[PDB]
Amino acid sequence: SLVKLFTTNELMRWPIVQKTYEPVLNEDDLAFGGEANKHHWEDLQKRVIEHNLRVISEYYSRITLLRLNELLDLTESQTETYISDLVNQGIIYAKVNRPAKIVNFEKPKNSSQLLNEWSHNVDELLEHIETIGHLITKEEIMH
Amino acid sequence: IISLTYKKISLRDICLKLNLDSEQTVEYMVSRAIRDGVIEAKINHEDGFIETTELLNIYDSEDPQQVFDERIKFANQLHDEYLVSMRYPEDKKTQQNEK
Amino acid sequence: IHCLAVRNFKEAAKLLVDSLATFTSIELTSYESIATYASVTGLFTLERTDLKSKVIDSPELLSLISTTAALQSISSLTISLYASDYASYFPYLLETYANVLIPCKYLNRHADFFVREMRRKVYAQLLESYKTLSLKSMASAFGVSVAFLDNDLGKFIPNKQLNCVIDRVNGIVETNRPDNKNAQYHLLVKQGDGLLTKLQKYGAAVRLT
Amino acid sequence: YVAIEQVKDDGTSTEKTFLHLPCTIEAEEAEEIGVEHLLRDVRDQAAGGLSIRLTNQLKSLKGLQSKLKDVVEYLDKVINKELPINHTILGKLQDVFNLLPNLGTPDDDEIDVENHDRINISNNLQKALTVKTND
Amino acid sequence: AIRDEIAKNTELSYDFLPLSNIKALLFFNNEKETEKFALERNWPIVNSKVYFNNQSKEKADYEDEMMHEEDQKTNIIEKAMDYAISIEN
Amino acid sequence: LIETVFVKNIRMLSFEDISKATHLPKDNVEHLVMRAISLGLLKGSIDQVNELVTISWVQPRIISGDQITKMKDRLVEWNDQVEKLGKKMEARGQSIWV
Amino acid sequence: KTAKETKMLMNLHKEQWQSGLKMYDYEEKEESNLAATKSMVKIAEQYSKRIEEEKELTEEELKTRYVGRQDPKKHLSETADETLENNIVSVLTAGVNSVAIK
Amino acid sequence: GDELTRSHFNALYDTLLESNLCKIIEPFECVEISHISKIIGLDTQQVEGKLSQMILDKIFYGVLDQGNGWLYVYETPNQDATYDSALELVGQLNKVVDQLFEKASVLY
């Protein structure tokens, strides 16, 4: 149940996931049961929040920073450190308004790029209607 | 020139500079002027400044298509002019006797 | 000297910086004078970038040091521009006007040309680095009044190097400079209009003849 | 058309039917040189000069207009002649309305700048032909 | 004539004038003249405030219905077609 | 939710109207819409600088007499643009169609 | 041969006209704009060279000296015409597509 | 006491600032100019002066809005390349018409 949650893009609320598997798998032997590994449960936080962070850039082109702190369930100063980290690694690309009002997920567009998507829309339409017409013809004889 | 320089300017400042009697008199000569879009501004009397109406980059706007349209026709006209005319001396020269 | 004496300060800037190296003393206005004048023509013409290479790092000007007062006044001015300390720039401007432009005969007539240009060029560089400034802030830096600034800048805007407008009420000086596609549109449309004028004149002429 | 055998899923038995496959022409090299040599016509559309593709622009519109009509009339026939509901054609038409270009896209604003580039290079190339004729 | 001219100008300036400003600018001597003129300009007076907003939009709408017109705006399709036959003459 | 956007020819509707439509508060609607994308039942983008959902993709809904009627209109409407244009385009440059 | 068969040998297609409302990508329009203009810059230097003098006797002499063989004036005209023609098709199709669909 | 030490310790100053400046600004949009001072350890007046000089050099070319205390940094602004090629082409045509007329001076 654990493994499939983290793959799927569904929002994963950190202290909720933490709490549920806390009395079972944190106490489960060596991997989390070890003395050094007690600190590998805490580090599990980063891991969770970064998968949601990744999904949400995709989905929200524009989100308020304020809101984003709530969903990931973190301190605001921390979240912002983490936005910077993932942009630095170039995993995501973002534009951060420092007072914390808006965080804008912006991947580079250019003029050519936008027009190239539109050029296809036009052509794809004309092909669809053509195909349909032969299929109108088929049904007339079958009736 | 004053709207060009100062974007937002109180009627008070205009009046003192150019000697014009009062803020009400300046508003009337300006109101007429902007209809015709000489000055290109809009008055705000309920605040008290006059704010230039920018167009900024006009490439961004659709202005260049109209510019082009005319010019193309001018080029086209010269080509036809070249062509009718070029023939004129040639017709004479052929018919005259040559060695 | 010819180009310097006349209104075209473009050719002068070129001719004179290379006369530094090839100075011939024989029947000519002293070496000290030439060096000062080169700097003057330097400042009017040359871009901030192009001043650095050719005038500041110019090996001769550094060899000659500042000894004569006029050389010192003009040289110091150059420096604070690049370094962009605009506390010390405007005091130097006052000095160069008294001791350099007015007593030199050539630059008595061009005093007006040179000082108007310097005011516009420094203010242009500062506007480029700011989307927005206060009037109090620009003024305070210079060491001129808010009133003083407001008049002197409105002379320079319609000649168009500053490229700014001033919101009096908010007191902001906002800066609007094109760098986009519009730049490449203006250059094209103007050059191509200049070409058409020539085609008409010449074509129509040859048909008649 | 190729005879395929598939369950028509609607509460109707296995149906055997003729599903359209687009077809194209093709010529063997050996035939083709001879096809071309036989032909010598100026063509309704060859993708030749300006005037030829221009004819095709007038044709292409009138093409679409007849083509769309066929759709409107099928929709009548379903509720008036009880032609079997084919959820498949109607599904494809949903994709047409759904993926439909709209205006006020930033894509219009992009096309609008592009318009200006296409005339501006045209304008200059017009001006250049002036110089050649004058020569 | 004076009042008509100013009224036309002040459309471009703003949408709203306090009741007192309309009376002053156009040289109305009574508030009766003010509210009369507003009706003839298709502006309602609701809560002692005019409302130029109405008529401006409505005038654009009516103008769009005329027949002269295709060549006056100049369609993209139209622009190309002219140049093509300019060449193919 | 998937139905309400479909019938509208407008392909963006605010959250607040969706809040009414689904009979759940606006806190819950924002989350639901994040899940709608994951599944891929709807696709689009999410803007909380106007509290809008702008869709670019909507699942085909089930065929009903009512919805067909909307289809019939749409293709009639487009058909008039085509007609208007081709006749205007005929006239301009009448002489060259070689 | 018959005139029923000639119709068959050419083959009429619907994709002759369907290809006329297909709008190819705009990266490709950019490339053509860029390329065609740059090319004629190169032969425009050569053209300056052509007409520098060129007015002294014997036509043959002129064609070797000013390289009027493989004519640069003519090549400028050709590149110009092809691009000019296409950029007009390109505006014409795009205008038709946009109103007609939506 | 050592002029060389001074010269090269001033180059050392500015370089050390630049390496750190790059790190602060890669997430962009609109960083606060205050936020810079915290990290760098230089005062708000000192931030402004260094930053203005470097805008003119064009090593990261941005603009500073004082009214909001933000630094927006811009990189690769778009400009018509098609038109760049056309400016040289029109330039050639202009010489050419002067030469052509000169050839055509024989008509007179």
From Swiss-Prot, chain A:
Highest taxon of source: Eukaryota
PTM notes: N-acetylated by NAT1.
All copies of domain PCI, residue ranges: 1-110
Additional free-text comment from the UniProt record: Present with 5710 molecules/cell in log phase SD medium.
Family membership: Belongs to the proteasome subunit p55 family.
Function as written in the Swiss-Prot or TrEMBL entry: Acts as a regulatory subunit of the 26S proteasome which is involved in the ATP-dependent degradation of ubiquitinated proteins.
This protein's name: 26S proteasome regulatory subunit RPN5
Naturally occurring in which organism (per UniProt): Saccharomyces cerevisiae (strain ATCC 204508 / S288c) (Baker's yeast)
Gene that this polypeptide is encoded by: RPN5
Span covered, complete protein: 298 to 440 of 445
Curated annotation (Swiss-Prot), chain B:
Signal peptide (UniProt feature, chain positions): none
Organism encoding this protein: Saccharomyces cerevisiae (strain ATCC 204508 / S288c) (Baker's yeast)
Assembly with partners or alone: The 26S proteasome is composed of a core protease, known as the 20S proteasome, capped at one or both ends by the 19S regulatory complex (RC). The RC is composed of at least 18 different subunits in two subcomplexes, the base and the lid, which form the portions proximal and distal to the 20S proteolytic core, respectively.
Portion of the full-length sequence here: 394 to 492 of 523
Summary of the function given for this chain in its UniProt record: Acts as a regulatory subunit of the 26S proteasome which is involved in the ATP-dependent degradation of ubiquitinated proteins.
Phosphoserine modified-residue sites: 61
Residue ranges with Basic and acidic residues bias: 87-99
Sequence similarity: Belongs to the proteasome subunit S3 family.
Full protein name: 26S proteasome regulatory subunit RPN3
Post-translational changes noted in the entry: N-acetylated by NAT1.
Miscellaneous note of the record: Present with 16700 molecules/cell in log phase SD medium.
Membrane-spanning intervals of the chain: none
Swiss-Prot record, chain C:
Subcellular location: Nucleus
Organism for this UniProt entry: Saccharomyces cerevisiae (strain ATCC 204508 / S288c) (Baker's yeast)
UniProt subunit comment: The 26S proteasome is composed of a core protease, known as the 20S proteasome, capped at one or both ends by the 19S regulatory complex (RC). The RC is composed of at least 18 different subunits in two subcomplexes, the base and the lid, which form the portions proximal and distal to the 20S proteolytic core, respectively. Component of the lid subcomplex of the 19S RC.
Protein name as it appears in the record: 26S proteasome regulatory subunit RPN7
Domain (PCI) ranges: 8-180
Function: Component of the 19S cap proteasome complex which acts as a regulatory subunit of the 26S proteasome, involved in the ATP-dependent degradation of ubiquitinated proteins.
Any further remark recorded for this protein: Present with 51900 molecules/cell in log phase SD medium.
Gene name of the encoded protein: RPN7
Curated annotation (Swiss-Prot), chain F:
Keyword hit for rRNA-binding: no
GO biological process: proteasome assembly; proteasome-mediated ubiquitin-dependent protein catabolic process; ubiquitin-dependent protein catabolic process
One example GO MF annotation: structural molecule activity
Keyword set, alphabetical order: Proteasome
Annotated Gene Ontology cellular component terms: cytosol; nucleus; proteasome complex; proteasome regulatory particle, lid subcomplex; proteasome storage granule
Similarity comment: Belongs to the proteasome subunit S11 family.
Misc: Present with 12400 molecules/cell in log phase SD medium.
Biological role: Acts as a regulatory subunit of the 26S proteasome which is involved in the ATP-dependent degradation of ubiquitinated proteins.
Protein name: 26S proteasome regulatory subunit RPN9
Source organism of the structure: Saccharomyces cerevisiae (strain ATCC 204508 / S288c)
Taxonomy of the source species: Eukaryota, Fungi, Dikarya, Ascomycota, Saccharomycotina
Gene: RPN9
